[PDB]
Amino acid sequence: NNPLSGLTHKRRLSALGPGGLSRERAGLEVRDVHPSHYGRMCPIETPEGPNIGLIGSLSVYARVNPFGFIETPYRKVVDGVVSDEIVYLTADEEDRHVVAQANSPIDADGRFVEPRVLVRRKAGEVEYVPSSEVDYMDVSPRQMVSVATAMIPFLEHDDANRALMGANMQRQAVPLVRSEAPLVGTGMELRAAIDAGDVVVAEESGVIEEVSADYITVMHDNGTRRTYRMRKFARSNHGTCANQCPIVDAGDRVEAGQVIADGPCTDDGEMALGKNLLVAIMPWEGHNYEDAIILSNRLVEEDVLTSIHIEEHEIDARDTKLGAEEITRDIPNISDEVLADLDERGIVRIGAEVRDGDILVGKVTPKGETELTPEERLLRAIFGEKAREVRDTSLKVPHGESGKVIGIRVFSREDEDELPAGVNELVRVYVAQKRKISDGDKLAGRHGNKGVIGKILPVEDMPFLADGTPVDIILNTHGVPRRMNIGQILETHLGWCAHSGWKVDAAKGVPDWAARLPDELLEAQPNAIVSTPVFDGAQEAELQGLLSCTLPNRDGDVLVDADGKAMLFDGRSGEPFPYPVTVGYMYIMKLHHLVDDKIHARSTGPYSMITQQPLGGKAQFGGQRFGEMECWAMQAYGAAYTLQELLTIKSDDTVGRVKVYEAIVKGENIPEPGIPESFKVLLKELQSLCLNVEVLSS
């Protein structure tokens, strides 16, 4: 779905498969977090479902010993002074040492300011120790964290399970058409995008000779020149676009390792899985009730949240006992307008838009003839219908999607192409849909605050600041304090500060809060980008001081006051909202749970063979599962006839099914249900086990 998902599928530690315990075998002690995990395997990033705890991710600094044991780096302290020497330590020797803390008050010389420091002892315990006794120290913060989780701002302000949810949803965000870099982030996005391999990098330093939309040629120093071909609109394994775009000029020089062309979910070479949205955190008219989300219509209009979804369809012409199926535009008993998009080859033209029920490949099979019913003979007699000896098992687009056609690949044996034995022609057809954002789609922050889209609202009917800028997205305020993810609000405040810019007035020195704040951060231009490393982050006092000085936008106006709130105008009644509500910029991503891929309905479709139950799943035509719990609920209501109908004439009684369809089409009342076929199957099954089971009528 994105370079994050790829990089997290790699560098992942499973606990299933041959030679290991299985989900049927997992123990709670196995699923627990062992204290030896620190710096080896992340305790936050893990799947949420039944396999919770059996799959994790390598810590960002982890390494594998030659014998398959996970080891992590750590600095050493001698004489109570931390050296620059780094040694890699396995969990075996860690118990024989006393490892100090990453964010300890170092004195720029090697010594800690307090004699007693908080450390981990042999048995996984945490305690205070005189400084002159420790022997190891953490290389950095975020040593204990994975690669995905390390991209969550204000992680330390988030609860463990909500941070787990956020890290698990970081890897399901679809790639949009723009992928704007987040206003607030961590420094991990650059390295993640570089190491995910989805961004072209200059392998040799040199000037750039010429650039187009598909290739980039670089003139190296030593006479030779190199060409990087750039993949465009290639479908990934999960049906998302993998477009790549150049970010370089025609004359600029590049160094080895520099980004040349950004990928699907990247901006200027750093990972960008969503968009910055102006957010208010007040409840609105009940449309954001119970984790629902509201958005302005300008997100639909400006294509802020839109995605390209490419789908491939396959059909093969294969030899058979009666001859060979042929892919040809000549297909019996078909109209002409539906054949307009078909070329002479028999395959839809590239660029011809298609919709549900249309033919992509006209593939016709040799059937000969079957039992010709009297009516077919009468019809060919009355009108003049011909032999039409062949059958049409043509490729039709599956029910429920449309869109344009990108390209076609055609394989045949006459062109030397290797094919499976028995198949002489293979055809794959690629179809794209530019899916816009709609209600039912799932949005999420980086802090586990997910929700579906309750309603898309017209841009006029949205709360707008005094400047007149409407808010873009509205989230409910009851979801924050119950789930303990205040870090998202911290991110909101810092995002507003980074969007507006700031200047700390150093008229008489720097203020007290900015004494330890780094230089070059006292003054930031509008629309700046800031990085908050997960545990050496931005303190609350620093954020408050930044919010204090938040230089005005266009004219002299501080829309957001000292405490981060602002005054909004109700776009429906016009009267100002009685109390200020917090507004800011939050990074919102669209997850791969689009309603278009989750909507199903069935009236009558296929049935299974052994028992006449309907099929299941969107691949077949489906049919919902009425389980034992639903049967219990139906009996609890005392409702019997609907239970009879849900079990008999909708799932097993074949004569009942046909008769009920005839009755409903003709307009008469539903007939009496019969005997389910599954019960007869059970009866014969028990009979085949040498059991004399029968039914007695009196």
Binding site: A102, L190, E255, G257, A528, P533, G537, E542
Partner: peptide
């Protein structure tokens, strides 16, 4: 930054790590 084409990203980090990722 140690990456030639890195966009500037001001940071709130107080401490300097010894070794890179």
């Amino acid at each position: 930054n140690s990456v030639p084409g890195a966009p500037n990203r001001v940071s709130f980090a107080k401490l300097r790590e010894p070794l890179e990722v």
